[PDB]
């Protein structure tokens, strides 16, 4: 319990425990030796003043030098370490779990914090496990996300929130689900648009589309494959369009848990949907399950017109082509349906801005 250079009798907890040589040096002589070694000697002369015993020594010594040295003496130690040993700045690591900063100049990918003594990846900063060895980092975090019970317990609700609502005017991203309400209001730029097709909701007398009969009312214009229209389809007919194109869809979970944002006095509070989750709807609302089916339809660019009857084709022609169709002489309902379906799919494309 004596200082190995001055002999001063101090408790062990009141001296500098030099990690490299395990001496016991009082704070005064610790300051004295390393300050003169930097201001008048070379950094290679920074051995222990008691005994006299590489870059992992400087990493452990940097911690003790930060505590006892002066701010300007500590800056001179970085300068000579940079200008004399490394030819560059030292790589300073922050431990994400204990917030301790330390120098790490080793070639290994896993670094151990000198404070909390936990191992983490130098690029990930996630806690290290043997499953990360030999695996890419993106593969590792996606492995922990695929094996988290609380993550998987939410089910398809996490899929609807990943499909973010991007405001087409200000490009702000909202990690939300569309649900049943299609009229979206952006708080950043006040733009009003549909969350399914990203088309504009026009105010009174602001719609420029020709042959529109609701110009004096707030409304938007949606393609035939928008959630605005396909929400009116039954869940059965929606998934038959998926089945007709060999697209899988959930009916069982792998109150509705989809997170919504309600208005509260102190901003916005996250609240689950909590609606009735019928059987065969993957444990979600009817509105959110239909949103889940429509996202699969839009991702594969499935055309709902392939299931249109004759009346539905006449409606789509008057809406998107602004021409009332009429059967030709010699046509039967199949020929009249085939003609309208062909001209509709040739002249009117699907959603040119629907998230796919």
């Amino acid at each position: 319990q004596e200082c190995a250079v001055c002999g001063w009798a101090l408790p062990h907890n009141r001296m500098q425990a030099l990690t490299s040589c395990e001496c016991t040096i009082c704070p005064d002589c610790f300051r004295q030796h390393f300050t003169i070694a930097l201001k008048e000697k070379h950094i290679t002369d920074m051995v222990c003043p008691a005994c006299g015993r590489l870059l992992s020594y400087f990493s452990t010594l940097d911690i003790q030098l930060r505590e006892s040295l002066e701010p300007d003496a500590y800056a001179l130690f970085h300068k000579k370490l940079t200008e004399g040993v490394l030819m560059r700045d030292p790589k300073f690591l922050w431990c994400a779990q204990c917030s301790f900063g330390f120098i790490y100049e080793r070639e290994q990918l896993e670094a151990t914090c000198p404070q909390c003594h936990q191992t983490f990846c130098v690029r990930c900063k996630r806690q290290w496990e043997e499953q990360h060895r030999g695996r890419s980092c993106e593969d590792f975090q996606n492995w922990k996300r695929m094996n988290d019970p609380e993550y998987q317990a939410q089910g398809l609700a996490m899929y609807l929130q990943e499909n973010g609502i991007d405001c087409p005017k200000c490009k702000f991203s909202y990690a939300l689900a569309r649900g049943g309400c299609m009229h979206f209001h952006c708080t950043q730029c006040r733009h009003q648009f549909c969350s399914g097709c990203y088309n504009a909701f026009y105010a009174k007398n602001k719609c420029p589309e020709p042959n529109c009969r609701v110009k004096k009312s707030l409304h938007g214009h949606h393609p035939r494959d928008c959630l605005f229209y396909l929400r009116d389809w039954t869940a059965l007919r929606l998934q038959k369009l998926l089945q007709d194109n060999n697209v899988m869809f959930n009916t069982e979970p792998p109150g509705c848990r989809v997170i919504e944002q309600k208005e509260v006095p102190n901003g916005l509070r996250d609240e689950a949907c909590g609606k009735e989750t019928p059987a065969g709807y993957a444990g979600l609302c009817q509105a959110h399950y239909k949103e889940y089916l429509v996202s699969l339809i839009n991702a594969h660019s499935l055309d709902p017109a392939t299931l249109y009857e004759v009346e539905e084709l006449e409606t789509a022609t008057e809406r998107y082509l602004h021409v009332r169709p009429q059967p030709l002489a010699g046509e039967d309902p199949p020929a009249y349906q085939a003609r309208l379906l062909q001209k509709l799919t040739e002249e009117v494309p699907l959603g040119q801005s629907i998230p796919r």
Partner: nanobody, 120 residues
Framework: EVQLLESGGGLVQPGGSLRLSCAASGFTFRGYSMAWVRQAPGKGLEWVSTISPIGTYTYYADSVKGRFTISRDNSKNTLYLQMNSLRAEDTAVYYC?????????????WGQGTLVTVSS
């Protein structure tokens, strides 16, 4: 005593570019890392980027990676932030910060921020 003065803020159209600067004094500029932090409307502080004392290492937040570029001129104790492809979400007060090596503090002082707003 540490003194940090920001400069370069203003009104920018979406997709535009802007260059912030920060004049530092009161400490050895070459001995510490420097960082930019910002305050979005109704928020606290969000880390933007950090540059090593001589510039060997540059770090960026994910939302600004590839769009922002941090740099420093130790000859004049000046920190820089080149901002390209500015979005409406980048609207914030941008603060100049002096780095620290102590645990729990990547920066110990930040200056009088300069306001950057992106029109919509």
């Amino acid at each position: 005593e540490v003194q940090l003065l920001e400069s370069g803020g203003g009104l920018v159209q979406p997709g535009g570019s802007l260059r912030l600067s920060c004049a530092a004094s009161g400490f050895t500029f070459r001995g510490y890392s420097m960082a930019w932090v910002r305050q979005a409307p109704g928020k606290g502080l969000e880390w933007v980027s950090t540059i090593s004392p001589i510039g060997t290492y540059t770090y960026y937040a994910d939302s600004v990676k590839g769009r922002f570029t941090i740099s420093r001129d130790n000859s004049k104790n000046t920190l820089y932030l080149q901002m390209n492809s500015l979005r409406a979400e980048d609207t914030a007060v941008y603060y100049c910060a002096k780095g620290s090596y102590s645990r729990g503090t990547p920066f110990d002082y930040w200056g009088q921020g300069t306001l950057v707003t992106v029109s919509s």
